[PDB]
Amino acid sequence: ARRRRAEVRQLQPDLVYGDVLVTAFINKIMRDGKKNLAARIFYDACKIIQEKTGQEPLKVFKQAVENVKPRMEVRSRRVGGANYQVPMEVSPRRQQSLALRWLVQAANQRPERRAAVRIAHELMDAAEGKGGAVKKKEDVERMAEANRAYAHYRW
Amino acid sequence: KRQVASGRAYIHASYNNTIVTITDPDGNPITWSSGGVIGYKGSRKGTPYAAQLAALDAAKKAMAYGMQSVDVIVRGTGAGREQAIRALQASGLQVKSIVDDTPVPHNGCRPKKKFRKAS
Amino acid sequence: PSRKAKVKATLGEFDLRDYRNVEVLKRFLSETGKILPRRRTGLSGKEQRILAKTIKRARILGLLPFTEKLVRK
RNA sequence: GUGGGAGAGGGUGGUGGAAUUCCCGGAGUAGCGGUGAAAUGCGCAGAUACCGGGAGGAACGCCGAUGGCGAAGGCAGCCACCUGGUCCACCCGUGACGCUGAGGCGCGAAAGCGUGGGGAGCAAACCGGAUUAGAUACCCGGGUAGUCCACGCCCUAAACGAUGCGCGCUAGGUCUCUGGGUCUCCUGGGGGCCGAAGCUAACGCGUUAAGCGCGCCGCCUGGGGAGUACGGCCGCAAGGCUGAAACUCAAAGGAAUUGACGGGGGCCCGCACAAGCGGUGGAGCAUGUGGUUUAAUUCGAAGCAACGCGAAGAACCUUAC
Ligand SMILES: [K+]
Ligand SMILES: [K+]
Ligand SMILES: [K+]
Ligand SMILES: [K+]
Ligand SMILES: [K+]
Ligand SMILES: [K+]
Ligand SMILES: [K+]
Ligand SMILES: [K+]
Ligand SMILES: [K+]
Ligand SMILES: [K+]
Ligand SMILES: [K+]
Ligand SMILES: [K+]
Ligand SMILES: [K+]
Ligand SMILES: [K+]
Ligand SMILES: [K+]
Ligand SMILES: [K+]
Ligand SMILES: [K+]
Ligand SMILES: [K+]
Ligand SMILES: [Mg+2]
Ligand SMILES: [Mg+2]
Ligand SMILES: [Mg+2]
Ligand SMILES: [Mg+2]
Ligand SMILES: [Mg+2]
Ligand SMILES: [Mg+2]
Ligand SMILES: [Mg+2]
Ligand SMILES: [Mg+2]
Ligand SMILES: [Mg+2]
Ligand SMILES: [Mg+2]
Ligand SMILES: [Mg+2]
Ligand SMILES: [Mg+2]
Ligand SMILES: [Mg+2]
Ligand SMILES: [Mg+2]
Ligand SMILES: [Mg+2]
Ligand SMILES: [Mg+2]
Ligand SMILES: [Mg+2]
Ligand SMILES: [Mg+2]
Ligand SMILES: [Mg+2]
Ligand SMILES: [Mg+2]
Ligand SMILES: [Mg+2]
Ligand SMILES: [Mg+2]
Ligand SMILES: [Mg+2]
Ligand SMILES: [Mg+2]
Ligand SMILES: [Mg+2]
Ligand SMILES: [Mg+2]
Ligand SMILES: [Mg+2]
Ligand SMILES: [Mg+2]
Ligand SMILES: [Mg+2]
Ligand SMILES: [Mg+2]
Ligand SMILES: [Mg+2]
Ligand SMILES: [Mg+2]
Ligand SMILES: [Mg+2]
Ligand SMILES: [Mg+2]
Ligand SMILES: [Mg+2]
Ligand SMILES: [Mg+2]
Ligand SMILES: [Mg+2]
Ligand SMILES: [Mg+2]
Ligand SMILES: [Mg+2]
Ligand SMILES: [Mg+2]
Ligand SMILES: [Mg+2]
Ligand SMILES: [Mg+2]
Ligand SMILES: [Mg+2]
Ligand SMILES: [Mg+2]
Ligand SMILES: [Mg+2]
Ligand SMILES: [Mg+2]
Ligand SMILES: [Mg+2]
Ligand SMILES: [Mg+2]
Ligand SMILES: [Mg+2]
Ligand SMILES: [Mg+2]
Ligand SMILES: [Mg+2]
Ligand SMILES: [Mg+2]
Ligand SMILES: [Mg+2]
Ligand SMILES: [Mg+2]
Ligand SMILES: [Mg+2]
Ligand SMILES: [Mg+2]
Ligand SMILES: [Mg+2]
Ligand SMILES: [Mg+2]
């Protein structure tokens, strides 16, 4: 990425909720390019958000993704004599990429042996403000700013 | 406690730390702070942030004496001089003025090696 | 680059060797009590050299300052 | 000579404000200082930061310049006194009274020496703290001589324009300091830059010559040995001046050229880093290799660019042991 600002890939809107943000999440759940099994998993997960929540699946989803978005994150950087963990604002873009990554990550750190469940349960624990995902998000925000003494290394 | 309401705020900037001193209209200190008073103890006392906290600590402590408006006086250069100037303004205290009064000799004492060969 | 009407223009006749004319000399000092350069004084090499000698006399008499504190920053 | 001018030129006395340190008083409290990060250090016997009073030493901010003065070293707050040089105008006076200058005599940055004084800050040596593989250094905290004054020594230097002094001659352009004029501009003295002709190995120099010429002084004659030894002179000393030989080398050396290089600068690329996804390094095994073993373990490949490579087929064969 030395020559251009690398445009962002536009993803094919969802084959159901038609939302693009969903396809994104599905791609993260995916592995070994099993686009099928991936999407399936995300869908039975919306079905579980149903049989346990009178609320719309998609609504729960986008809600969680929102609480998992870090607005600040510490980025390393050298200033001669040591590396200073420098706090810094997080891009609208990176926020989403991070939120989604973390959800799948936490979801798979859960106990229930059914994939579709973990995702579902994680999406919920998130909507409320709990769960391994929101944890990282809060661990980083606090981990950043906790170094506010290096706010003058803007970058 | 003693009630002053109006006084002065001195900011001593240094490339090693910033320290603020609030005083009555005659220049007698009422309270003070610095990067060291707040947590910081190494090279962070110099930080613009440390200066901020030191500045706010100073104001609040001077609220206890019921002070409200100050006359800021700045001395020295130093990472975090301006943050203090700002930290005060936005802190209940009414900044009536800001004045730079850093001492500079009309060339008298030979500097330490570290500060020579200048100009 | 220091263009705000040189102090000489905005002024009339005056004895550059008069160390007591505070109202006139005072003009050649900056916000601080520092002697303005030539870019500001507008004076000439020879004139400016006499201004200095003059001002430094004023200062010792107390009519003029050596240094001023800057109001702002 | 007369009349004007500029200047940190020199000497003596006086004197002004800023800052640092220390002392005193106030107010005030837990740190300050310092670095890459730290520590030594200082602070509750109250430091740091702030206000007021005092003492002392040293140096003069802005003006300040690409500026000015001096033979050089060098000279910078302001005032007075004493004193040097120098430029211009007027063509007034003398009438070649001139140039250079071995030796002599004087001056001569810093450090250093002697006697006495002074001592704020800074600081060889030195005492400590860090750093490092070590660190008799670079960084940090201290600190004596010294730095300052007087008187007397020392006499060196990248004491440099690395360019001896004087005079005459040879296009201009442009900025500048200082004087005179009919004051767009002309004219004299000084400081810069670009350049005619010309010079130069080149770089460059070019009316401020490194050009063209004359006068006088100083100096050079390959490198190392060596600015040493000896002698002499000088010095309180440190040491200065003058200044070799044996031996030994095929060079030492100047300028410029093309590269290469840089813990030099600028601009710019690559899955180079960063962002990210999967993996190796751990296990079992397959395979190549090192090593070791063997009668033989055929040979080659070696960091990248050797190691599932030559081997796209080793039971005999292949096969070189
Ligand atoms: K000095
Ligand atoms: K301590
Ligand atoms: K301090
Ligand atoms: K000069
Ligand atoms: K000594
Ligand atoms: K001296
Ligand atoms: K002498
Ligand atoms: K004239
Ligand atoms: K030539
Ligand atoms: K050149
Ligand atoms: K020559
Ligand atoms: K001798
Ligand atoms: K003698
Ligand atoms: K002797
Ligand atoms: K380069
Ligand atoms: K790579
Ligand atoms: K990054
Ligand atoms: K291993
Ligand atoms: Mg510090
Ligand atoms: Mg005369
Ligand atoms: Mg003159
Ligand atoms: Mg004149
Ligand atoms: Mg003088
Ligand atoms: Mg006190
Ligand atoms: Mg202690
Ligand atoms: Mg106590
Ligand atoms: Mg005590
Ligand atoms: Mg007390
Ligand atoms: Mg103090
Ligand atoms: Mg005081
Ligand atoms: Mg004194
Ligand atoms: Mg003393
Ligand atoms: Mg001269
Ligand atoms: Mg010189
Ligand atoms: Mg004279
Ligand atoms: Mg005549
Ligand atoms: Mg005659
Ligand atoms: Mg002579
Ligand atoms: Mg001498
Ligand atoms: Mg000397
Ligand atoms: Mg000396
Ligand atoms: Mg002595
Ligand atoms: Mg002595
Ligand atoms: Mg003494
Ligand atoms: Mg010291
Ligand atoms: Mg030291
Ligand atoms: Mg002697
Ligand atoms: Mg020189
Ligand atoms: Mg001619
Ligand atoms: Mg012209
Ligand atoms: Mg002229
Ligand atoms: Mg000229
Ligand atoms: Mg000059
Ligand atoms: Mg030519
Ligand atoms: Mg030549
Ligand atoms: Mg050539
Ligand atoms: Mg030239
Ligand atoms: Mg000549
Ligand atoms: Mg000789
Ligand atoms: Mg020889
Ligand atoms: Mg010698
Ligand atoms: Mg010989
Ligand atoms: Mg010989
Ligand atoms: Mg020989
Ligand atoms: Mg060469
Ligand atoms: Mg290219
Ligand atoms: Mg590329
Ligand atoms: Mg590519
Ligand atoms: Mg990477
Ligand atoms: Mg990874
Ligand atoms: Mg393995
Ligand atoms: Mg074999
Ligand atoms: Mg073998
Ligand atoms: Mg072979
Ligand atoms: Mg082999
Ligand atoms: Mg065989």
Side-chain angles (χ1 to χ4, degrees):
Chain A
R2 202 191 280 289
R3 190 179 292 273
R4 190 166 305 188
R5 196 197 199 74
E7 24 86 306
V8 189
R9 288 175 177 274
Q10 301 299 64
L11 310 85
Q12 282 311 317
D14 185 16
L15 294 303
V16 173
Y17 297 71
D19 178 43
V20 305
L21 173 49
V22 162
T23 310
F25 187 72
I26 304 174
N27 296 319
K28 281 291 194 182
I29 299 181
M30 171 166 28
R31 59 177 57 170
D32 291 19
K34 291 197 165 184
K35 190 83 175 186
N36 207 210
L37 149 50
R40 169 178 292 161
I41 290 180
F42 175 65
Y43 284 149
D44 319 321
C46 291
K47 262 58 179 177
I48 296 182
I49 294 294
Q50 282 289 49
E51 183 174 358
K52 198 169 301 180
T53 296
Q55 308 191 63
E56 315 163 0
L58 184 58
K59 172 190 173 59
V60 175
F61 173 68
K62 302 192 177 184
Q63 179 55 59
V65 178
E66 184 63 12
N67 306 306
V68 200
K69 286 182 184 178
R71 294 177 312 296
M72 294 273 240
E73 78 187 310
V74 57
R75 272 176 155 192
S76 189
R77 176 182 175 180
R78 159 163 283 286
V79 189
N83 297 302
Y84 299 66
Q85 283 298 71
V86 183
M88 209 181 101
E89 286 200 57
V90 178
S91 169
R93 163 77 190 188
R94 191 173 170 64
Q95 281 181 174
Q96 181 187 302
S97 300
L98 277 170
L100 295 176
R101 185 173 309 137
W102 296 341
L103 296 174
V104 186
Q105 283 194 270
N108 284 304
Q109 271 289 62
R110 270 176 162 276
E112 40 275 277
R113 51 281 295 273
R114 298 170 52 188
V117 179
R118 288 190 299 272
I119 295 72
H121 285 178
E122 188 66 10
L123 274 147
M124 301 176 78
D125 276 47
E128 299 187 10
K130 45 181 187 176
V134 185
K135 174 61 160 301
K136 310 191 178 191
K137 176 277 187 175
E138 302 181 313
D139 261 59
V140 55
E141 283 191 350
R142 158 187 46 204
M143 214 270 274
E145 172 293 328
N147 285 293
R148 189 179 307 188
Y150 307 155
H152 54 309
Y153 297 4
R154 200 52 50 189
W155 170 20
Chain B
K1 41 64 185 174
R2 208 275 279 164
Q3 317 308 294
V4 177
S6 61
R8 275 126 66 160
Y10 290 72
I11 311 179
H12 173 83
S14 157
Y15 279 89
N16 276 336
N17 160 41
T18 309
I19 85 190
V20 193
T21 294
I22 286 68
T23 65
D24 68 312
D26 290 9
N28 308 93
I30 281 170
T31 54
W32 64 273
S33 193
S34 76
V37 152
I38 325 313
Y40 303 121
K41 290 197 171 303
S43 50
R44 308 181 202 173
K45 297 182 274 183
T47 303
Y49 188 53
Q52 180 161 72
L53 301 187
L56 297 174
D57 191 43
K60 295 166 191 175
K61 289 184 179 186
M63 301 291 224
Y65 286 61
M67 180 173 285
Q68 300 157 60
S69 81
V70 295
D71 266 332
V72 180
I73 301 164
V74 207
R75 289 183 179 162
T77 303
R81 162 219 285 172
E82 244 53 51
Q83 264 300 284
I85 312 287
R86 262 108 68 179
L88 294 201
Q89 295 175 305
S91 72
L93 289 175
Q94 181 192 61
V95 177
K96 292 303 301 175
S97 82
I98 311 186
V99 177
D100 182 319
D101 187 40
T102 306
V104 41
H106 297 355
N107 276 291
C109 281
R110 171 180 260 230
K112 325 194 65 182
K113 170 174 172 185
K114 191 220 301 177
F115 303 78
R116 289 188 64 259
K117 287 185 293 182
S119 64
Chain C
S2 179
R3 306 302 168 63
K4 320 157 192 180
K6 282 64 181 301
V7 177
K8 177 175 184 174
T10 76
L11 189 55
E13 174 177 296
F14 62 90
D15 178 25
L16 271 171
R17 200 164 305 174
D18 183 42
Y19 51 89
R20 292 183 296 167
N21 199 183
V22 181
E23 33 289 309
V24 172
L25 303 168
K26 203 208 311 174
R27 308 278 283 84
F28 295 105
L29 299 173
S30 64
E31 318 66 68
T32 310
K34 299 188 163 185
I35 302 180
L36 287 151
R38 291 255 298 283
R39 293 88 67 186
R40 290 283 300 91
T41 57
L43 289 173
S44 67
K46 192 182 176 182
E47 297 177 307
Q48 184 79 50
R49 189 179 324 131
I50 307 179
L51 177 69
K53 208 71 180 310
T54 301
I55 286 179
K56 297 178 185 178
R57 290 181 150 184
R59 290 182 176 166
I60 300 182
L61 281 185
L63 313 172
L64 277 179
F66 285 65
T67 193
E68 308 280 54
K69 4 199 67 171
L70 184 74
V71 286
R72 263 305 192 306
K73 188 181 184 175

